[PDB]
Write a protein that binds this ligand. Structure first.
Ligand SMILES: CCN(CC)C(=O)c1cc(-c2cc(CN3CCN(CCCCc4ccccc4)CC3)cc(C(=O)N[C@H](CC3CCCCC3)C(=O)NC)c2)ccc1F
Ligand SMILES: CCN(CC)C(=O)c1cc(-c2cc(CN3CCN(CCCCc4ccccc4)CC3)cc(C(=O)N[C@H](CC3CCCCC3)C(=O)NC)c2)ccc1F
Ligand SMILES: [Ca+2]
Ligand SMILES: [Ca+2]
Ligand SMILES: [Ca+2]
Ligand SMILES: [Ca+2]
Ligand SMILES: [Ca+2]
Ligand SMILES: [Ca+2]
Ligand SMILES: [Ca+2]
Ligand SMILES: [Ca+2]
Ligand SMILES: [Ca+2]
Ligand SMILES: [Ca+2]
Lengths: 626, 626
């Protein structure tokens, strides 16, 4: 900051100087008519150069020198420490004519130096450092810098019908732990010279994205900037001072919101009561609002939310028994209305649930929805149609939080699609760079019908499980050749089950073969996208046998329990029970799925839906580089 | 592109292969029950590896080998050259049981290889190279790559009431010179196997940003993609073929439009008449739509558009005489409704006029407006409030096309502002990274009232001229001390002029002094922004004397002709005539302005408004790095 302050003909000029800046001071134009030259005195804690065509030259407090008056002779004026005294520091210029050695006129400059700094934790260690030089920018990576702000989308006080950030009020001191600290630090005399004040302010635009709070009697919580509050005039305390504000995020990154917000402080000069003139100093901090992040299946489970809204014991017992052999909780009352994720800042973080188009909205449990407006919901809006990969590297790039996957239709198909308003939210989060797959070939239309990830438990590595109809046909032709043709299929369930569906019955159904050829085609289309977009190879993929029937819409609905659609609890796999053609003790499908999976570390339990909240990534999203 | 194609139990499978891709082919799952092993034959121009847990292995056309059947034993299938024959190329697998040496079943794959490439001039030399590997991306800098598309905002046929891009029709072959070439190149047999076609397509979103044309009888101009045309089915010509399309841009970069657009081609498989299935190959080109670019005063003038809509001869004659001593034209009938700029691509470029909230819309003379909607126009929307710097470097960054400057008010002032819709357009152009100044302290509210750039003609360097009231007062106190106090001011003009305004009269007006102190403050505020944002120093600045009077709104209107508000024609400066206090032959203001400027190369002519179209930058905007 080089800033202009001219001397004024015949006058003394009072100026505030902010430490960190430079004054350039015209002396020429204040000079009386007929002067040819000037000297100057200045005070101890004011540094003063003279400057002609770029050539600097320090000058003594005391010296008696005279120079030639000229528009290209100017001063540069700096100060090193704040004033304890309103003025005291000063620069005084004497002007002189051809003859005499007494000055003909003089002009002066009376400085009050102050320090003003609006400070944030741009280096991201949870401590509000002093005037971080990067605090007005935001960069990615471990070298990156720039403060981080959470959306205050949880709830501290449960009598509130909505989340914290929905009001312009802080009710509990609990709340402030979710907030980001911003410190106005000042250093100067017992007061400001007359005509100055300090204003914090925000833009109209940012006014619905931030809320700023002052804690009085640090007690009451003063809402100073935010909705319908674009500025706030700050009472200066003299001496070395610090004001503490707490900042809450209100809106997630989204369509038309990068997630970056600014807050400013200005030293504003006034002419009277009212009559604002111009700022003489401005300081600015940047915040990025933390994205919502989804949790893939490789990440350790913390709790498993079931909800059979009926009378289940054996679904409750095989899901309870599985959960027990893990660290984690059960949590009864699902997969289609709710997606678990989190938000993190260096100070703080907590789980947030995306709610599909309220209920778990608690302390340290946050909440977002996105609401269509014109576009109608379909089946593809259900969060069974929303999954996320493990960490992957795709051709050099790294995706340390994985990628979101959403089922879709082809763009010129007229098919179903998840609402744009949810699609836009998810891409706007950036850090899980979403991928559209093709799920609309399915009656229901969900990615979780045909793929799943499982961690290989020694690693540190995962596998893509894919449904495969061709795998199924290969298996049946073996069984039937093994003499199990007349072995009956799907004897178990108590609605639509088996009127002697045998393998033979199936294998000789030519119509159903062709449908399943079309479906294998839909599957291979997805396989090619997943391989490309998660940088996978055939090494990384296991095809689980699967069979569909083609409904009236030309869409697949499962023939028997889709086994890829499982609960992944670390090493325990909760895998739907197929009920299929036997050979002895157990099923030849169950034994086949046990065949592929168990030799890798994976411990399959077959269950006759759920949802699992998981540990965050250790990996900090700000260290990424999207 | 690794792409899945399975063999199918007992069947022969016909596939199209696109050169540049890889097939992965499952053999396991097509295998009959009880086989333990497979061999394979394949044709000359089909390369075939076998692959287990990652381990490759080429195989002979001829060989007789057998391998062990297993899900992790698969093939990889490539081809090197296109087919002249529908099929001919092929891969055939034999399956075998424990005993016999005759195959038990077989499965085959019958390939037709074709080459398909959608090509553009992503390397930006005006030639459409062959399958540029970067043609699906857009990058900046001399190393950057990515094709460029002009907005077709000029007019070839003048019977049209609007610009070319306003219809979905090309009337003249002239037009196509403004268009970008995109070449669908194919190489294959006399026809495609049954069930395939080639579709060009665009997104709904891009559909109002691009228009694509086919030239028939290369004759008629076929509009194939664009408004209400999202796809087009292409007739395949056999052999080595090339289809030529011409692409027009329709919309400039803007709020919510990055300026990037995509065009795709897919090979789409069908089941019947209708019944589209899935694409088997897709290719994509990217275009960036060229920004509108403004021309600063250092750039050589080409023509000077005057328009005194009255009876001017001495304004016509001093502007004509000045124009004559330059290369350039006069062009009579201005500065406030029109801004001259251009658009460039590697093939092509032409002047485009931004029209402030039609007339010069010609061949190779284009047109944009932006139209407010809710927001009302003010004086600050006039293009006197729109200027552009010379090339500058600001703290490492380079701005080789300069920066746009717009006068504004303070954001919490309730003051006037140029319409958002024009502000958003200008920033969206990116390459001249606009700067908001403070012009609302002026009655009219234009940046051109208080600053101007002039080229120093030996360089290669420019100067910022600033209006200065303090300079004026310094000058008058000299004159009055020189005994010119009673020398009369502003005797010339024929409306509001002089009832013995003398220097003395002015100097003793204390009220007017204070107003001009406030105005010098407004000026220094701007000075500080310009220094910061154009990386200038005091070396680079000349203050021209100037005086304002404060209207009822607390706003400056010039006291005498604002001399900074000049025509800059290379070395000739067309500088408003002040009419001020004399000493002999000429004015002491005129002689003072001649004093500062002429010693640098600059050749001042004083004129008792205009607009100048200039040469583009030699510098190509795509070599920048915003
Ligand atoms: C260039 C490709 N592309 C751009 C990326 C696509 O978006 C694309 C489009 C579709 C698609 C699918 C369906 C619906 N699906 C639903 C599932 N169905 C299963 C068939 C099952 C048959 C069976 C099998 C085995 C056994 C029994 C039965 C196939 C069709 C209908 C339509 C449709 O009619 N579109 C037209 C316009 C079209 C323009 C582009 C060219 C094609 C026309 C239209 O609406 N006009 C206004 C289009 C499919 C694949 C694609 F890649
Ligand atoms: C923190 C600074 N800031 C944020 C970046 C600003 O945007 C800012 C604002 C103004 C500004 C100016 C005017 C208009 N200008 C017009 C020109 N005028 C010349 C005075 C001429 C006097 C004279 C001289 C010499 C001789 C004779 C007369 C000054 C005022 C009116 C108002 C106004 O009344 N605003 C309030 C709200 C405000 C919130 C912030 C703090 C200030 C109040 C309001 O509308 N409430 C709802 C505000 C000026 C400078 C600034 F930097
Ligand atoms: Ca810190
Ligand atoms: Ca709150
Ligand atoms: Ca809270
Ligand atoms: Ca909390
Ligand atoms: Ca899910
Ligand atoms: Ca080229
Ligand atoms: Ca046209
Ligand atoms: Ca044209
Ligand atoms: Ca043209
Ligand atoms: Ca202009």
């Amino acid at each position: 900051r080089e800033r202009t302050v001219r001397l004024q003909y015949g006058s003394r000029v009072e100026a505030v100087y902010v430490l960190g800046t430079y004054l350039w001071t015209d002396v020429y134009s204040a000079a009386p008519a007929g002067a040819q030259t000037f000297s100057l005195k200045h005070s101890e804690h004011v540094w003063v150069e003279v400057v002609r065509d770029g050539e600097a030259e320090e000058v003594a407090t005391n010296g008696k020198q005279r120079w030639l008056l000229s528009p290209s002779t100017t001063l540069r004026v700096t100060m090193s420490q704040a004033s304890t005294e309103a003025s005291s520091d000063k620069v005084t210029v004497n002007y002189y004519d051809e003859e005499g050695s007494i000055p003909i006129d003089q002009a002066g400059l009376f400085l009050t130096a102050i320090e003003i700094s609006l400070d944030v934790d741009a280096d991201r260690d949870g401590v509000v450092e002093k005037n971080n030089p990067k605090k007005a920018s935001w960069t990615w990576g471990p070298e990156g810098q720039g403060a981080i702000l959470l959306v205050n989308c949880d709830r501290e006080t449960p009598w509130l019908p909505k989340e914290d950030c929905r009001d312009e009020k802080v009710y509990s001191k609990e709340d402030l732990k979710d907030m980001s600290q911003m410190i106005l630090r000042t250093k100067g005399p017992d007061r400001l010279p007359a005509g100055y004040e300090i204003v914090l302010y925000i833009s109209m635009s940012d006014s619905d994205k931030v809320g700023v709070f002052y804690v009085e009697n640090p007690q009451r919580y003063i809402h100073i900037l935010g909705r319908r509050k674009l500025y706030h005039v700050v009472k200066y305390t003299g001496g070395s001072a610090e004001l503490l504000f707490f900042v809450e995020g209100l809106c997630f990154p989204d369509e038309g919101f990068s997630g970056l917000v600014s807050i400013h402080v200005s030293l504003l000069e006034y002419m009277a009561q009212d009559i604002p003139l111009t700022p003489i100093f401005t300081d600015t901090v940047i915040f990025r609002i933390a994205p919502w992040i989804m949790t893939p299946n490789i990440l350790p489970p913390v709790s498993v939310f079931v909800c059979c809204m009926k009378d289940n014991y054996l679904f409750l017992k095989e899901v309870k028994n599985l959960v027990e052999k893990t660290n984690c909780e059960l949590k009864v009352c699902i997969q289609d209305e709710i997606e678990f994720g989190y938000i993190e800042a260096p100070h703080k973080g907590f789980p947030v649930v995306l709610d599909s188009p309220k209920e778990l909205l608690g302390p340290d449990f946050g909440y977002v929805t996105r609401e269509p407006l014109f576009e109608s919901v379909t089946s593809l809006d259900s969060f069974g149609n929303l999954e996320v990969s493990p960490p992957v590297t795709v051709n050099g790039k790294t995706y340390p939080l994985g990628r979101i996957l959403i089922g879709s239709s082809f763009p010129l198909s007229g098919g179903r699609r998840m609402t744009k308003v949810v699609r836009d939210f998810l891409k706007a989060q950036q850090v899980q760079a979403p991928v559209e797959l093709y799920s609309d070939w399915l009656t229901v239309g969900h990615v979780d019908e045909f793929m799943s990830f499982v961690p290989i438990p020694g690693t540190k590595k995962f596998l893509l499980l894919m449904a495969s109809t061709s795998a199924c046909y290969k298996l049946f032709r073996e069984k039937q050749k093994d003499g199990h043709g007349e072995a009956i299929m799907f004897k178990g369930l108590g609605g639509m089950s088996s009127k002697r569906i045998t393998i033979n019955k199936i294998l000789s159904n030519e119509s159903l073969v062709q449908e399943n050829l079309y479906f294998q085609r839909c599957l291979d289309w997805n396989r090619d996208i997943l391989k490309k977009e998660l940088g996978l190879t055939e090494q990384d993929i296991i095809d689980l046998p699967a069979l569909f029937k083609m409904d009236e819409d030309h869409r697949a609905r499962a023939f028997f329990p889709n086994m890829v659609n499982m609960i992944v609890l670390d090493k325990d796999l909760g895998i739907p029970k197929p009920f299929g053609p036997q050979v002895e003790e157990e099923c030849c499908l169950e034994m086949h799925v046990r065949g592929l999976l168990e030799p890798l570390g994976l411990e399959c339990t077959f269950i006759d839906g759920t949802n699992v909240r998981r540990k965050p990534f250790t990996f900090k999203w700000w260290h990424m580089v999207p």
